[PDB]
Amino acid sequence: WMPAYACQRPTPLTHHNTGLSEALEILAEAAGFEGSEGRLLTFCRAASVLKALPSPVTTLSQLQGLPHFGEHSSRVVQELLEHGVCEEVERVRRSERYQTMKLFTQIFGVGVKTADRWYREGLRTLDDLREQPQKLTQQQKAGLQHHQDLSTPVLRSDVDALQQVVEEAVGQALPGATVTLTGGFRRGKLQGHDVDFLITHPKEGQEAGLLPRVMCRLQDQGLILYHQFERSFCIFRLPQPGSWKAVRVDLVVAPVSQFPFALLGWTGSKLFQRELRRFSRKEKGLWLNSHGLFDPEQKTFFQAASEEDIFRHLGLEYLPPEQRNA
DNA sequence: CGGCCTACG
DNA sequence: CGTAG
DNA sequence: GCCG
Ligand SMILES: [Cl-]
Ligand SMILES: [Mg+2]
Ligand code: NA
Ligand code: NA
Numbered sequence: 001w002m003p004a005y006a007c008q009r010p011t012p013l014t015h016h017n018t019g020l021s022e023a024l025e026i027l028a029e030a031a032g033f034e035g036s037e038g039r040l041l042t043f044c045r046a047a048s049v050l051k052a053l054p055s056p057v058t059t060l061s062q063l064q065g066l067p068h069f070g071e072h073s074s075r076v077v078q079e080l081l082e083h084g085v086c087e088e089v090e091r092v093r094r095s096e097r098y099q100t101m102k103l104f105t106q107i108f109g110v111g112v113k114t115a116d117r118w119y120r121e122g123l124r125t126l127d128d129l130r131e132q133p134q135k136l137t138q139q140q141k142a143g144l145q146h147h148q149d150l151s152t153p154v155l156r157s158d159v160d161a162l163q164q165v166v167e168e169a170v171g172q173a174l175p176g177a178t179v180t181l182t183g184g185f186r187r188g189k190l191q192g193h194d195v196d197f198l199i200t201h202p203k204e205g206q207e208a209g210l211l212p213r214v215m216c217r218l219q220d221q222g223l224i225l226y227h228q229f230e231r232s233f234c235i236f237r238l239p240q241p242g243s244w245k246a247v248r249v250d251l252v253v254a255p256v257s258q259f260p261f262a263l264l265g266w267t268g269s270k271l272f273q274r275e276l277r278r279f280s281r282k283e284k285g286l287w288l289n290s291h292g293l294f295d296p297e298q299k300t301f302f303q304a305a306s307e308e309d310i311f312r313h314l315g316l317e318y319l320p321p322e323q324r325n326a
Numbered sequence: 327c328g329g330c331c332t333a334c335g
Numbered sequence: 336c337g338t339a340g
Numbered sequence: 341g342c343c344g
Binding site for chain 1 (some may be wrong): 343
């Protein structure tokens, strides 16, 4: 009664197993910091299964037959049900390695590989990194300067204000172009740590060259604190009462023929999209990305006019964005 | 055992 | 290497 | 870590 891929079941934003899923996600995150992508995936998938259940897990028996629950994930749940805490999870949380890898990987421009090297060199705090700016890229410098602001989530009201400024710039860059809110806010989140916009134009081809024109206009308005094409990873000035704060904004352009695929990809969740691409290839023999859906036997691309089309192509029941919170 | 999403900057 | 979801 |  629980399908094995996250894209085969609705997953709402809020659910009935929050504590259990959060603990499994700690172990997933820690597996990522050690470079164990397989373990990360399993713990992420197990957490997601609990998010999709219709009521709380209260007894170990209720895990029987659920996909992605084996000896390890079941033991974690069992300990939480019996004692309210899982010793393995708590040991991770307190560990110097987990806490430092988490802090460093939060920096825009720092991934697991860079964080781990710094950890191995003995660095532990943000002020440690500031004292040696010779080891920092310009991107990492911006990420470190703006880290505090970027650590606080923004509200949907902020997002709506940002969308108006983006729409103004896009309208001058290319009249008729449109701006769509994607990412977690499209899935229903009321607050989140970045904001994502997808830009297209109804006349195929007109969007060529658009992103540089948009960026120049936003820069000219004084709104761009940092930027580096079709994807732009920016830090924007967001107005706040009497002041402002830095916010991470991603801008993406797609031709209208690809828009459904780009909308689907950029709406997430990350696990949902990895699972959907895995399902596509392994179960359907079709190759999915944010540009299209390829049949490698006929050597053809599916045309889609909507996300609904893509779900139909793949033989999946349609899930609205609010149900893609895997 | 092999596999684990698939791109762009 | 980083980024995205 | 789990699935097929
Ligand atoms: Cl692994
Ligand atoms: Mg986002
Ligand atoms: Na980072
Ligand atoms: Na983003």
